[PDB]
């Protein structure tokens, strides 16, 4: 994480950079970036996934410099996020087909990482607001996770009780929570889910792509309590061991966020 | 329609069949290989269109200008530990995949639909509303089969499509992707808006002070460890911006 | 010689055009006969009911000219078309007739090679013949390339036809002719393969403009508007393993205006 | 050639069109548009493809109305290619699943054409300039083909010695040659290769689509010696016979090119 | 460097950059060594000829300052690049070496995981290291992350490198660094999977603009322009079942202009 004053003064620009690590489960000291092997075929009535098998959303709050010397002014300044550049880091590591992965056929190379994937990021001036939805409301989630409380069969579709802030790193399982489109007034989020056994990962990198964060009125996320929030989930697919066991593989996400100062009325 | 703000929102639940009290959002397991002459699907096996009528506040009518919409809970498909058949010995569960249909509509009247059947001889179950007096021509275009989407969880998705020859006061959008191995591909973002205005700059007009939302979001098939398959669907969020229009 | 647009001057016409997939018996409207396979090129005699054909309709329009021997005339000009394939959700019936994907599983979706095509013009669609096998012996009731040779498997300019009869020109024999069709706009996509997924969109918010670079749409000769289509959605696989083409109807809504022309 | 203003007026525009047949190998008198059946698994040291097994680029020269080439004359113009309409002809012929092709399974229809494909066209005022690259530099190419001369292992990557003009129809194998991005100043070319066993052909037709041939300065190919050059390769995929043998299938390409007169000095 | 106006009063440079796939013997230029599989993470020692590496070249340019004493100096600025992968049709040879798709059939096409990447800059490309397996023992002649840890499988900021040697930095170890490369533009797409079809386009009508948001392209501060690439097209499957990477060369044509800058 670096917070850099690119330009100072009234028209100040600050660039915040950071690399957000993935939270795939990390089943031993050597397997950072992977999950525990996947179980299968648990009855819905006895579905108790292990903690280290569940990828969780990544998040961080980045403190920004205070802008207001006198808190009793009629107007106060706030950091406004204007643009974000982002990409997934280490995509070429998946070209290692010699380590650990099941041969595609006799005398062949290892099997590429492939299968269901989810790539998501958000940038806001408040914590990302999430809505809970479950495959199976009867899943018994493990200690260390934060999941929908008092779920019912309606939790498999839409149960408006399941509202959360993404307010803890490595705790909200990706399978339990989605960004909430009915809230998030002060966050922009973007995600794509691609499901299936043989889905190919397709990932682009370039330092020439920028996403504008301004809304229809030309206003970007406003950093409340001088806090910038970054969130991500980048499940790249499944790694298949020679035994046949499968593990999720994730990668870190880079953010470069440009901010300016906006004058707001003192509430 | 003469010269020219409020926001309404809704989470609309999917109607996949719901075969028991625990399997909300799924269908009954699929049967297969029924002869066309003896094809009698059970009600809980048949996903239906979802719809809701939203009342609005009382010369002037409410005009729908934009909609933001997305499918809710897409990441729930990353649960590969519960119920699904292993992809191979020692592997994880099989993802939901296969034929899917994602559709929504926003209008000032109920959605107008046209009936088309795979098999006109299908015997549809009590509780469903399906094309009446079907013939072989119902497998192609039979103009008899007109309906309003006027009841939730009643019009099977397999029997009905939005009618492009009507719906003057509704905008609708749908994509069907068929095949046993089709990957679900679903996007979420709060930065995307669909404009509902036509080429005259007029959106759906809510006569009777009612807004209609409609959807179908069949995500694919869930394959149980036994090999049986069930449709899985997800709720759809709508946020609709409306303005007052003189008429 | 096209003059100015006139401004009563607008009309809309609409039509649903049924597919012509072969219709092997009275129950199987919208399907073909089961597909044969592995016929030697020297003994390839497909049955009529196995061959999907192009659909077409001629729509008469109000007769605008009292006297065709005047210096100037009025003609109907097609300006836009809205079009949609009808009944796409019917493929969500996986309980009827189709082969199980595996033991205890649901039926196999319709999938595989498909072709989606439409045209709107003021003359019949003009077609060019090309054959997989020039030696195919086509059945009575079809209209296919006459006097075909090996060159008919590539480009043989002899094979020019008008789409002037419904349910007669096999899709496998004929394509729209890009060297003609001055007065028709056409659009088609072929996707081939064993397992290709159908992907079909519906919306009442999409309009195709038919005006050329000079701002002129198709002009309706003899006050007739022509619509044409082919919508082979894929193959249906029966429990036995046999396969049949499945097609669907196409809707057209066409806006026309009056255009002054010189005689 | 210094480029001046576009000229308009009487006879300052023309349109030419052509259908260019594919050159897939044509293994006998009945199998025009196909190749000979594919061999497989030849060691790189003993790889001797038969001529009839090798698809080649197609090309033709279209004469244009004669303009005076005398650089000192008082009305010096060249034809300039502005747009091209083009599509592959006969795509629906692949819906014949009754003739020749292996059944997909017992009682099923024939197997569709599918697999690796290449769709390419070029329009220019000179012959298309090509660069040679080989899968295997040791391939022994057959009489009647023009292939990279005296190749080395570097010819499997980039060997700048392998420069050729597409100056003969049905002679330059598609597998040996690509358009050269370091030349072709006076040609516009466009190609897509999609490889794989089960790749679906995807082909669009419409008479409403046009490709603009003007560069960033608004200048299209200028036709030297009043000749317009068209080139193509349209390998649609592999046809699988009942035996399991495979043959390339190709189709003709249509071109309609609009040209205008350009003043030059 | 303080950037002033464009000097008005433009050149082009070009390069074909060869791929560095491993080249296991004198006849298999453009391929890797056969791929091993199923090595335990604890005993993963890939041979050098099995590892594709990034390609790079430096293009020398003449200094523009006849007087090096002027208040304002001049530098070459890269404005646009035309680029293309060369020899894509060579994959239509299904008669040589590749495993038959089925009895009596043709050879198996090249397919599977692929990576297509290029960069143009006024400084060598700046890279960040990320590993599949931090315990991999890389072979002599490669340059790979130093003193890796488990964090090197996600993001370890210690692993910074310059692409300063051709055929040395394995593609599997390194990515362009989005936190640096102020003076380089880079573009890459990774597509992974066993049966992924190569999809490659060629046209001489496509240009990539290299100007940033302020209208300034990479500046050749030391009178040098750097081109970099990786074009792994997929896997070639031999008749025996063994697999090898196949790569192809990349062409670059770069338009340069003269840019006034303040003298340091
Ligand atoms: C559209 C079309 O015309 N398809 C036909 C193709 C096509 O003309 C060619 O592929 C174009 O190059 O030809 C087919 O030919 C087959 C042979 O492949 C027929 O000759 C077919 O052959 C049958 O006998 C074959 C088997 O014994 C086979 C087993 O491996 O060996 C073949 O001979 C080999 C030989 O052993 C080998 O040394 C040599 O290198 O290659 C030859 C093949 O070229 C035998 O020919 C068979 O398939 O069982 C006997 C059949 O009676 C005969 N059928 C006909 C109609 O002649 C083709 O499939 O490629 C036929 C296809 O219809
Ligand atoms: C996600 C989940 O919980 N999946 C279940 C799955 C699911 O509930 C159904 O598919 C929804 O339709 O059911 C699985 O078990 C089924 C139960 O239906 C099989 O055991 C199936 O049961 C048959 O008999 C049933 C009775 O068991 C049940 O109590 O009552 C109904 C009538 O209301 C039936 O009589 C049946 O459905 O016909 C007998 C049949 O042999 C069984 N089929 C197979 C292939 O074994 C399932 O589909 O596997 C269990 C899964 O965990
Ligand atoms: C990439 C990798 O580590 N693959 C190994 C996997 C993997 O560790 C787990 O599936 C993650 O949950 O484990 C495999 O099984 C072995 C037993 O053969 C595991 O118990 C692991 O054994 C170790 O000795 C090892 O390094 O392989 C120690 C390791 O800590 C164990 N893993 C855990 C989570 O405790 C498997 O096939 O699943 C072996 C595979 O190579
Ligand atoms: C949707 C539907 O109606 N499917 C039925 C099909 C279908 O009517 C035809 O394929 C259309 O041409 O027919 C199925 O039965 C056929 C009837 O033709 C078979 O029983 C075949 O009958 C024969 O009499 C024949 O030659 O047609 C003998 C032949 O051996 C039979 N073929 C097989 C593979 O058994 C069909 O499976 O095609 C029944 C299907 O429900
Ligand atoms: Cl909750
Ligand atoms: Cl009805
Ligand atoms: Cl004819
Ligand atoms: Cl040469
Ligand atoms: Cl390092």
Residue numbers in the entry:
A (entry chain D): 32 to 298
B (entry chain C): 34 to 37, 44 to 97, 107 to 295
C (entry chain B): 33 to 39, 42 to 297
D (entry chain A): 32 to 296
E (entry chain E): 32 to 40, 44 to 298
The authors write:
The human polyomavirus BK Virus (BKPyV) is a non-enveloped, double-stranded DNA (dsDNA) virus that belongs to the family Polyomaviridae. A polyomavirus capsid consists of 72 pentamers of the major capsid protein VP1. Gangliosides were found to mediate cell attachment of BKPyV, and gangliosides GD1b and GT1b were later shown to function as specific receptors for BKPyV. Crystal structures of Polyoma, SV40, MCPyV and JCPyV VP1 show that receptors are bound in shallow grooves formed by VP1 loop structures on the outer surface of the virus.
We incubated BKPyV VP1 crystals in 20 mM GD3 oligosaccharide solution and solved the structure of the resulting complex at 1.7 Å resolution. The structures of unliganded and liganded BKPyV VP1 are virtually identical (r.m.s.d. of 0.4 Å for all atoms of one monomer), indicating that GD3 binding does not induce a conformational change in the protein. GD3 engages BKPyV VP1 at the top of the pentamer, which corresponds to the outer surface of the virion. Contacts involve residues in the BC1-, HI- and DE-loops of one monomer, as well as the BC2-loop of the clockwise neighboring VP1 monomer (BC2cw) and the DE-loop of the counterclockwise neighbor (DEccw). In both cases, only the terminal NeuNAc-α2,8-NeuNAc motif interacts with BKPyV VP1, while the Gal-Glc moiety projects into solution. The terminal NeuNAc 4R is the main contact of GD3 with BKPyV VP1. The sialic acid carboxylate group is recognized by two hydrogen bonds to the side chains of S274 and T276. The second sialic acid of GD3, NeuNAc 3R, has weaker electron density and makes fewer contacts with the protein. Its carboxylate group forms a salt bridge with the K68 side chain. BKPyV VP1 specificity for the α2,8-disialyl motif can be attributed to residues K68 and H138, which form contacts with the internal NeuNAc 3R.
